[PDB]
């Protein structure tokens, strides 16, 4: 790297990390990436618009970086609504984007361990009927690195594609 100007909440201590989720073939964990610059991303696809907005500038990132830098970066959604957003979905929906991306869903259970060890707080509210709801939802991306958080990320931070290419370049 060299004078790179940061735009995510950078950590000064980068705590460690790990969950358990559900994909569309198999249990997945953090510690299947734990070597990589893993964007975690916690978001429903059937969202108002920043799940597919943010997915463009995250991969509009990946675009920009050499062969080298990719083999070490990789995106994962999580969702916050497995009630609608099945791993299938979540999984597919990613890839529409870019296919370097993975989308996980499962046990409300396994979505919880996930959010817990971010810090994410998600809800449902008026909840009045079988289709009659909003989901509740912490809006974050988490930069993880050696198996620890190292940098923290709002969509209006994310949204800046090169502040995500400059952001991820300072810890290739």
Do not use: W
């Amino acid at each position: 790297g060299a004078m790179h100007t940061f735009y995510g909440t950078r950590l000064l201590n980068p705590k460690p990390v790990d969950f358990a989720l559900e994909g569309p073939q198999g249990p997945v964990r953090l510690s299947q990436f734990q070597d990589k610059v893993v964007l975690l991303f916690f978001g429903f696809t059937r969202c108002p618009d920043v799940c597919p907005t943010t997915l463009l500038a995250l991969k509009r990132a990946y675009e920009k970086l050499p062969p080298k830098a990719q083999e070490r970066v990789q995106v994962i959604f999580v969702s916050v609504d497995p009630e609608r957003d099945p791993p299938e979905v979540a999984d597919r929906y990613a890839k529409a984007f870019h296919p370097s991306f993975l989308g996980l869903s499962g046990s409300p259970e396994a979505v919880r361990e996930a959010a817990q060890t971010f810090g994410v707080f998600y809800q449902k509210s008026q909840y009045r009927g079988p289709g009659e709801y909003l989901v509740d939802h912490t809006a974050t991306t988490f930069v993880v690195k050696e198996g620890r958080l190292v940098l923290l990320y709002s969509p209006d931070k994310a949204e800046a594609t090169d502040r995500v290419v400059a952001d991820l370049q300072a810890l290739l």
